[PDB]
Amino acid sequence: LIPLGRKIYEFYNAPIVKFWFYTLAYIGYLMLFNYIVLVKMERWPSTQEWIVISYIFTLGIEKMREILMSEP
Amino acid sequence: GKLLQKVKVWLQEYWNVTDLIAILLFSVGMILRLQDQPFRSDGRVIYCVNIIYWYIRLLDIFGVNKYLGPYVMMIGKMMIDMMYFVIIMLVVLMSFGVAR
Ligand SMILES: CC(C)CCC[C@@H](C)[C@H]1CC[C@H]2[C@@H]3CC=C4C[C@@H](OC(=O)CCC(=O)O)CC[C@]4(C)[C@H]3CC[C@]12C
Ligand SMILES: CC(C)CCC[C@@H](C)[C@H]1CC[C@H]2[C@@H]3CC=C4C[C@@H](OC(=O)CCC(=O)O)CC[C@]4(C)[C@H]3CC[C@]12C
Ligand SMILES: CC(C)CCC[C@@H](C)[C@H]1CC[C@H]2[C@@H]3CC=C4C[C@@H](OC(=O)CCC(=O)O)CC[C@]4(C)[C@H]3CC[C@]12C
Ligand SMILES: CCC1(c2ccccc2)C(=O)NCNC1=O
């Protein structure tokens, strides 16, 4: 379990992996935010919309992390 | 000598491999055309889509002439630049399209 677990950890921390896994989540986000604006919305948000609502504020916390955990 | 190595030499020429795809497509268009409609109607359509290919194969026949020939290979290289135009246009087109 130690050679295999070293493979999963070193893969999912490589920067090219961490790029394309943020990219297939941005291209997954963009498809969802397309569906909620093209299709109708009711008074309460849809299941598709709630995932979009997650993606914006969780990106907001990350954007504040880039400010706080910076060099100055 | 190896049959698969003979096939790999053949796939190298791009105009040759796009011949045999259109030949098999025209065969598929025939078999539907020889059936009762609507199968015939759709094999009419398959027949008209090979027309999109077989005028473009006149580009390769045109390549023999020393002036039109370099003009044809000029077109193929600029389409690699046109693909980058297509991707950037695709973002701007669907951004206006979804918003509208
Ligand atoms: C990794 C990247 C490249 C793609 C990841 C995104 C897709 C897997 C998502 C984004 C848009 C999603 C679709 C958006 C909306 C709908 C409608 C949805 O239907 C309803 O909500 C009403 C009917 C029902 O309840 O089934 C069914 C799922 C579906 C097709 C989703 C299926 C999954 C999709 C294609
Ligand atoms: C996290 C995002 C940015 C990327 C990953 C995409 C998928 C994990 C998401 C995108 C679209 C989602 C689907 C969008 C809509 C629906 C319909 C939903 O149907 C119902 O809830 C039916 C009952 C009801 O209407 O309440 C079930 C979940 C499902 C399939 C979702 C399952 C999870 C999906 C595939
Ligand atoms: C950014 C540029 C370089 C490329 C993006 C444009 C194409 C991907 C779009 C533009 C016009 C679109 C077409 C416009 C109309 C139709 C007819 C449509 O058929 C119907 O609606 C059925 C008949 C009817 O209901 O009237 C099927 C999609 C299609 C071929 C569309 C497919 C996608 C096309 C080719
Ligand atoms: C919102 C886009 C993105 C991103 C995604 C891929 C490449 C570059 C940036 C993200 O999804 N989260 C972190 N920062 C970002 O701006």
Side-chain angles (χ1 to χ4, degrees), chain A residues 3 5 7-9 11-70 72, chain B residues 1 6-7 9-12 14-100:
Chain A
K7 289 202 154 204
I8 311 295
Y9 187 72
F11 178 84
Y12 278 139
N13 290 318
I16 190 167
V17 177
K18 260 193 281 201
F19 174 71
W20 277 107
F21 182 75
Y22 276 50
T23 300
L24 294 174
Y26 197 65
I27 280 172
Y29 164 61
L30 183 63
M31 286 198 185
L32 294 174
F33 183 76
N34 284 358
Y35 179 94
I36 62 170
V37 295
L38 289 198
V39 191
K40 67 184 289 184
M41 41 195 68
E42 293 83 3
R43 186 267 182 275
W44 285 132
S46 66
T47 291
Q48 284 96 342
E49 201 193 324
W50 282 125
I51 291 152
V52 163
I53 293 180
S54 315
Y55 190 101
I56 288 304
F57 288 171
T58 75
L59 164 79
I61 303 173
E62 157 76 14
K63 278 285 159 284
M64 301 295 208
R65 183 180 64 83
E66 291 184 358
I67 300 172
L68 295 200
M69 293 196 153
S70 72
Chain B
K6 292 181 181 179
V7 166
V9 161
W10 182 65
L11 271 53
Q12 184 62 255
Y14 288 125
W15 271 125
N16 265 4
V17 65
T18 59
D19 278 356
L20 208 49
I21 301 192
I23 297 169
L24 300 167
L25 183 63
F26 173 91
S27 314
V28 159
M30 191 166 38
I31 302 146
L32 289 180
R33 186 267 182 275
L34 288 161
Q35 303 322 297
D36 25 49
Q37 290 248 152
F39 317 136
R40 176 164 339 154
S41 208
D42 283 277
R44 278 204 70 250
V45 176
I46 297 169
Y47 271 27
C48 309
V49 176
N50 296 295
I51 298 297
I52 301 299
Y53 173 60
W54 296 110
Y55 293 103
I56 302 294
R57 184 176 177 86
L58 294 174
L59 277 296
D60 186 74
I61 280 182
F62 279 169
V64 176
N65 172 254
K66 65 178 72 66
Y67 312 98
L68 283 159
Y71 205 87
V72 165
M73 271 145 278
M74 211 85 58
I75 297 169
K77 304 252 181 303
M78 308 318 199
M79 293 177 70
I80 307 148
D81 296 340
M82 211 175 68
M83 153 163 89
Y84 297 151
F85 167 91
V86 164
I87 294 146
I88 300 305
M89 211 55 98
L90 183 63
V91 170
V92 182
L93 191 145
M94 304 174 43
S95 66
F96 174 49
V98 170
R100 183 178 182 271

Short mmCIF file of all heavy atoms in Angstrom, two decimals, chain B residues 63-88:
data_model
loop_
_atom_site.label_atom_id
_atom_site.label_comp_id
_atom_site.label_asym_id
_atom_site.label_seq_id
_atom_site.Cartn_x
_atom_site.Cartn_y
_atom_site.Cartn_z
N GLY B 63 -2.75 20.08 -57.84
CA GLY B 63 -1.42 20.29 -57.30
C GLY B 63 -0.31 20.06 -58.31
O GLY B 63 0.84 20.38 -58.04
N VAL B 64 -0.64 19.50 -59.48
CA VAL B 64 0.37 19.19 -60.48
C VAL B 64 0.92 20.46 -61.11
O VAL B 64 2.13 20.58 -61.37
CB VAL B 64 -0.23 18.24 -61.54
CG1 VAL B 64 0.75 17.96 -62.68
CG2 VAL B 64 -0.67 16.98 -60.86
N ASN B 65 0.05 21.44 -61.34
CA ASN B 65 0.45 22.73 -61.88
C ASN B 65 1.35 23.47 -60.90
O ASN B 65 1.10 23.48 -59.69
CB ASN B 65 -0.79 23.57 -62.21
CG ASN B 65 -0.45 24.99 -62.60
OD1 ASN B 65 -0.66 25.92 -61.82
ND2 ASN B 65 0.06 25.17 -63.81
N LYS B 66 2.42 24.08 -61.43
CA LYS B 66 3.48 24.64 -60.60
C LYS B 66 3.08 25.92 -59.88
O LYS B 66 3.86 26.42 -59.06
CB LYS B 66 4.72 24.90 -61.45
CG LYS B 66 4.55 25.96 -62.52
CD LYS B 66 5.83 26.18 -63.30
CE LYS B 66 6.12 25.00 -64.21
NZ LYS B 66 5.10 24.88 -65.29
N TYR B 67 1.91 26.48 -60.17
CA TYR B 67 1.43 27.69 -59.52
C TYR B 67 0.31 27.41 -58.53
O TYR B 67 0.36 27.90 -57.40
CB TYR B 67 0.92 28.68 -60.56
CG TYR B 67 1.86 28.91 -61.73
CD1 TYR B 67 1.66 28.24 -62.94
CD2 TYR B 67 2.90 29.82 -61.65
CE1 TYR B 67 2.49 28.45 -64.02
CE2 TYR B 67 3.75 30.03 -62.73
CZ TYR B 67 3.53 29.34 -63.91
OH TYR B 67 4.36 29.55 -64.99
N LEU B 68 -0.69 26.63 -58.94
CA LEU B 68 -1.80 26.29 -58.05
C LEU B 68 -1.36 25.29 -56.98
O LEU B 68 -1.96 25.22 -55.91
CB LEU B 68 -2.96 25.71 -58.85
CG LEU B 68 -3.85 26.69 -59.63
CD1 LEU B 68 -4.58 25.95 -60.74
CD2 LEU B 68 -4.84 27.37 -58.69
N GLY B 69 -0.34 24.49 -57.28
CA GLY B 69 0.17 23.49 -56.37
C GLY B 69 0.72 24.03 -55.06
O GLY B 69 0.31 23.62 -53.98
N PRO B 70 1.69 24.96 -55.14
CA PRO B 70 2.11 25.67 -53.92
C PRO B 70 1.02 26.49 -53.25
O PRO B 70 1.10 26.75 -52.05
CB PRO B 70 3.25 26.55 -54.45
CG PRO B 70 3.88 25.68 -55.44
CD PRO B 70 2.71 25.10 -56.20
N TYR B 71 0.02 26.93 -54.02
CA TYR B 71 -1.11 27.64 -53.44
C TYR B 71 -1.96 26.72 -52.57
O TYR B 71 -2.56 27.16 -51.58
CB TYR B 71 -1.96 28.26 -54.56
CG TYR B 71 -2.77 29.47 -54.14
CD1 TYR B 71 -2.22 30.74 -54.19
CD2 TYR B 71 -4.08 29.33 -53.71
CE1 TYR B 71 -2.97 31.85 -53.82
CE2 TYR B 71 -4.83 30.43 -53.34
CZ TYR B 71 -4.27 31.69 -53.39
OH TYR B 71 -5.01 32.79 -53.02
N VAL B 72 -2.03 25.44 -52.93
CA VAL B 72 -2.84 24.48 -52.17
C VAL B 72 -2.18 24.15 -50.84
O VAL B 72 -2.83 24.16 -49.78
CB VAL B 72 -3.10 23.22 -53.02
CG1 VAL B 72 -3.61 22.07 -52.16
CG2 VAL B 72 -4.10 23.53 -54.11
N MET B 73 -0.86 23.88 -50.85
CA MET B 73 -0.14 23.65 -49.60
C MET B 73 -0.03 24.92 -48.77
O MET B 73 0.23 24.85 -47.56
CB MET B 73 1.25 23.06 -49.86
CG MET B 73 1.31 21.54 -49.93
SD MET B 73 2.51 20.89 -51.11
CE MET B 73 1.60 20.99 -52.63
N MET B 74 -0.18 26.09 -49.40
CA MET B 74 -0.30 27.33 -48.64
C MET B 74 -1.56 27.34 -47.78
O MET B 74 -1.53 27.78 -46.63
CB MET B 74 -0.30 28.53 -49.59
CG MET B 74 0.32 29.79 -48.99
SD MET B 74 2.10 29.86 -49.17
CE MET B 74 2.28 29.73 -50.95
N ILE B 75 -2.68 26.85 -48.33
CA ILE B 75 -3.96 26.85 -47.63
C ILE B 75 -3.91 25.95 -46.39
O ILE B 75 -4.42 26.31 -45.32
CB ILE B 75 -5.10 26.44 -48.58
CG1 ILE B 75 -5.23 27.45 -49.72
CG2 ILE B 75 -6.43 26.30 -47.86
CD1 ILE B 75 -6.13 27.00 -50.83
N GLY B 76 -3.26 24.79 -46.52
CA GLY B 76 -3.23 23.83 -45.42
C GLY B 76 -2.45 24.32 -44.21
O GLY B 76 -2.78 23.98 -43.07
N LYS B 77 -1.41 25.12 -44.44
CA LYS B 77 -0.63 25.65 -43.33
C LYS B 77 -1.35 26.80 -42.63
O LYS B 77 -1.23 26.97 -41.41
CB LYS B 77 0.74 26.10 -43.82
CG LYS B 77 1.56 25.04 -44.54
CD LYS B 77 2.72 24.55 -43.68
CE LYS B 77 3.56 23.51 -44.40
NZ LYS B 77 2.76 22.33 -44.85
N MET B 78 -2.09 27.63 -43.39
CA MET B 78 -2.79 28.75 -42.76
C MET B 78 -3.99 28.29 -41.95
O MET B 78 -4.49 29.05 -41.11
CB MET B 78 -3.26 29.77 -43.80
CG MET B 78 -2.21 30.28 -44.77
SD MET B 78 -0.62 30.62 -44.01
CE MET B 78 0.12 31.68 -45.25
N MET B 79 -4.48 27.07 -42.17
CA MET B 79 -5.61 26.59 -41.38
C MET B 79 -5.20 26.20 -39.97
O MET B 79 -6.05 26.12 -39.08
CB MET B 79 -6.31 25.41 -42.06
CG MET B 79 -7.00 25.73 -43.35
SD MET B 79 -7.66 24.19 -43.97
CE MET B 79 -8.94 23.97 -42.75
N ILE B 80 -3.91 25.92 -39.76
CA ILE B 80 -3.43 25.71 -38.39
C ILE B 80 -3.50 27.02 -37.62
O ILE B 80 -3.84 27.05 -36.43
CB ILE B 80 -2.01 25.12 -38.41
CG1 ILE B 80 -1.97 23.87 -39.28
CG2 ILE B 80 -1.55 24.77 -37.00
CD1 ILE B 80 -0.66 23.66 -39.99
N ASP B 81 -3.20 28.13 -38.29
CA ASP B 81 -3.40 29.45 -37.70
C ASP B 81 -4.88 29.78 -37.58
O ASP B 81 -5.27 30.53 -36.68
CB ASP B 81 -2.68 30.50 -38.56
CG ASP B 81 -1.17 30.31 -38.57
OD1 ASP B 81 -0.64 29.64 -37.67
OD2 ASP B 81 -0.53 30.82 -39.51
N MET B 82 -5.71 29.23 -38.46
CA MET B 82 -7.15 29.51 -38.42
C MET B 82 -7.83 28.75 -37.29
O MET B 82 -8.91 29.16 -36.84
CB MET B 82 -7.81 29.18 -39.76
CG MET B 82 -9.01 30.08 -40.09
SD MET B 82 -9.78 29.86 -41.71
CE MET B 82 -10.49 28.22 -41.53
N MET B 83 -7.24 27.64 -36.85
CA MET B 83 -7.78 26.89 -35.72
C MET B 83 -7.67 27.70 -34.43
O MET B 83 -8.59 27.66 -33.60
CB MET B 83 -7.05 25.54 -35.60
CG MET B 83 -6.98 24.93 -34.21
SD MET B 83 -6.57 23.17 -34.23
CE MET B 83 -4.78 23.23 -34.16
N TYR B 84 -6.59 28.46 -34.27
CA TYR B 84 -6.41 29.29 -33.08
C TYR B 84 -7.39 30.46 -33.11
O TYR B 84 -7.84 30.93 -32.06
CB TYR B 84 -4.97 29.78 -33.03
CG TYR B 84 -3.95 28.66 -32.89
CD1 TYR B 84 -2.67 28.81 -33.39
CD2 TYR B 84 -4.30 27.44 -32.32
CE1 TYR B 84 -1.75 27.78 -33.30
CE2 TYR B 84 -3.39 26.41 -32.22
CZ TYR B 84 -2.12 26.58 -32.72
OH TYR B 84 -1.20 25.56 -32.63
N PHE B 85 -7.71 30.93 -34.31
CA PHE B 85 -8.77 31.90 -34.51
C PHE B 85 -10.13 31.31 -34.15
O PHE B 85 -11.00 32.01 -33.62
CB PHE B 85 -8.71 32.40 -35.96
CG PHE B 85 -9.91 33.18 -36.43
CD1 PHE B 85 -9.95 34.56 -36.30
CD2 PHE B 85 -10.97 32.54 -37.08
CE1 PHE B 85 -11.03 35.28 -36.76
CE2 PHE B 85 -12.05 33.26 -37.54
CZ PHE B 85 -12.08 34.63 -37.38
N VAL B 86 -10.34 30.02 -34.45
CA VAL B 86 -11.64 29.40 -34.20
C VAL B 86 -11.89 29.22 -32.70
O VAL B 86 -13.00 29.44 -32.21
CB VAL B 86 -11.76 28.07 -34.98
CG1 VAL B 86 -12.89 27.19 -34.46
CG2 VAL B 86 -12.03 28.36 -36.44
N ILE B 87 -10.84 28.86 -31.95
CA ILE B 87 -10.99 28.66 -30.50
C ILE B 87 -11.28 29.98 -29.79
O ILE B 87 -12.17 30.06 -28.93
CB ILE B 87 -9.74 27.97 -29.92
CG1 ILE B 87 -9.61 26.55 -30.48
CG2 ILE B 87 -9.78 27.92 -28.41
CD1 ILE B 87 -8.18 26.10 -30.67
N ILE B 88 -10.57 31.05 -30.17
CA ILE B 88 -10.76 32.35 -29.52
C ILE B 88 -12.11 32.94 -29.92
O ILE B 88 -12.82 33.52 -29.09
CB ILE B 88 -9.59 33.29 -29.86
CG1 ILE B 88 -8.27 32.69 -29.36
CG2 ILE B 88 -9.76 34.64 -29.20
CD1 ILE B 88 -8.24 32.36 -27.88
#
